[PDB]
């Protein structure tokens, strides 16, 4: 079976999240969504750095055409951070837009660029809860003239995103729904329609909650299972098809991104945050980063945000 390696050099994270593989510099970026920190790992040189801010963060994506600059979330603001990748604080911060200026207890959560470079991201209550809690989030994309457009509401925990290779489908996770949804995606109008369930956890006895996801070159989705101690591989050709399961030692698996020189090593983040209603004892919940090899598939390099 696949080899799952704990990345010792990286330590433990409260809620490690938002992995992004920059293929030209062979570098993994990621965040901690509770500790207000950004992280950089260069596997070939065993180099790790971090950056501290004073707002909650949930994604970090290189800015297309601007080395040393990243598009990030700072609470409810989408911003450009100028960061040399090694100093413990940003050089400067340029706010782009506040997506929800008058919802004081919301935050941005997962974000990713579509294959065209458009940033998509969703919000949630800071005090969201599973299985039941306040449902206050929405799904946005950042469009022309730095204005966002809204595509879906009534989202409890805005999470993983992916797009099909032919640009006809988008896949999206609200963790509270315990399913992955598929949508028809119109790349020319950047609109989504015909929402329907692709994969429903209860139909397949999958525990936990879907969190982050990514898609491989064959069109399979790889989904992180929070409180499931696993990643799952699901079909996009047929609804409700579980293709494979890979166990990850950490129970609270949060997200996934393909990386390595040949885009065939799957990086997996997890959360060490100990929750009061967990299905796993505290001794099991650590928050390591993992690397999975031997899956027999390749993914895609992480896409930069175009502004």
d(CA 196, CA 151): 14
Q: 278 Cβ partners below 8 Å, 6+ apart?
A: 227, 251, 285
Q: Is 300 in the site for Hg ion (CB under 5 A)?
A: no
Q: Is 30 in the site for Hg ion (CB under 5 A)?
A: no
Q: How many CA atoms lie within 13 A of 222 on its CB side?
A: 28
Q: Is 174 in the site for Mg ion (CB under 5 A)?
A: no
Q: Is 38 in the site for Hg ion (CB under 5 A)?
A: yes
CB of 97 to Hg ion, least distance (A): 17
Q: Is 159 annotated as a binding residue?
A: yes
Please identify which of the residues 211, 216, 250, 264 carries the catalytic annotation. 211
Q: Is 234 in the site for Hg ion (CB under 5 A)?
A: no
Residue 83 or 171: the one with the smaller Cβ distance to Hg ion is: 83
The two structure tokens encoding residue 198: 């692709």
Is the distance from CB of 171 to CB of 215 less than 8 angstroms?
yes
Q: Is 181 a catalytic residue?
A: no
**Nearest Cα to 115, choosing from 141, 95, 139?**
141
CB of 43 to Hg ion, least distance (A): 19
Interface stretch with Mg ion, choices 5-13, 47-55, 84-92, 157-165 (CB under 5 A): 157-165
Number of residues engaging Mg ion in binding (CB under 5 A): 4
Q: Which listed option, Hg ion, Mg ion, none, makes contact with residue 211 (CB within 5 to 8 Å by class)?
A: Mg ion
Binding test (CB under 5 A) with Mg ion, winner from 159, 213, 214, 252: 159
Interface stretch with Mg ion, choices 131-139, 203-211, 231-239, 269-277 (CB under 5 A): 203-211
Binding site for Mg ion (CB under 5 A): 110, 159, 211-212
Binding site for Hg ion (CB under 5 A): 38, 51, 70, 81, 83, 90
Binding residues for Mg(2+): 17, 159, 211
């Amino acid at each position: 079976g696949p080899v799952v390696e704990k990345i010792a050099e990286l330590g433990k994270y409260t809620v490690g999240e938002g992995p992004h593989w920059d293929h030209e510099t062979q570098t993994l970026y990621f965040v901690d969504t509770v500790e207000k920190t950004f992280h950089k790992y260069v596997p070939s040189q065993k180099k790790y750095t971090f950056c501290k801010v004073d707002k909650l963060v949930s994604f970090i994506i290189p800015l297309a055409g601007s080395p040393g600059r990243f598009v990030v979330s700072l609470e409810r603001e989408i911003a450009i951070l100028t960061w040399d990748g090694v100093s413990a604080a940003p050089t400067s911060i340029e706010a782009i837009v506040n997506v929800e200026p008058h919802i004081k207890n919301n935050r941005l959560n997962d974000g990713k660029a579509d294959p065209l470079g458009n940033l998509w991201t969703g919000t949630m209550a800071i005090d969201a809860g599973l299985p039941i809690g306040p449902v206050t989030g929405s799904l946005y994309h950042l469009g022309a003239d730095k204005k966002v457009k809204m595509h879906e509401s009534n989202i409890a925990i805005a999470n993983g995103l992916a797009w099909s290779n032919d640009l006809k489908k988008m896949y999206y996770i609200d963790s509270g729904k315990r399913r992955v949804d598929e949508y028809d995606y119109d790349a020319s109008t950047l609109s989504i329609s015909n929402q329907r369930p692709l994969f429903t956890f209860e139909k397949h006895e999958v525990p936990g909650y879907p969190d982050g996801q990514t898609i491989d070159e064959e069109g399979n989705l790889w989904v992180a299972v929070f409180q499931g101690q696993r990643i799952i591989k699901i079909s996009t050709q047929q609804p409700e098809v579980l293709l494979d399961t890979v166990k990850i030692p950490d129970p609270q698996v949060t997200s996934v991104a393909f990386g390595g020189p040949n885009l065939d090593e799957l990086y997996v983040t997890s959360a060490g945050l100990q929750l009061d209603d967990s299905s796993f004892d505290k001794s099991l919940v650590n928050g390591h980063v993992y690397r999975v090899t031997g899956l027999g598939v390749k993914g895609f390099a992480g896409v930069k945000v175009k502004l």
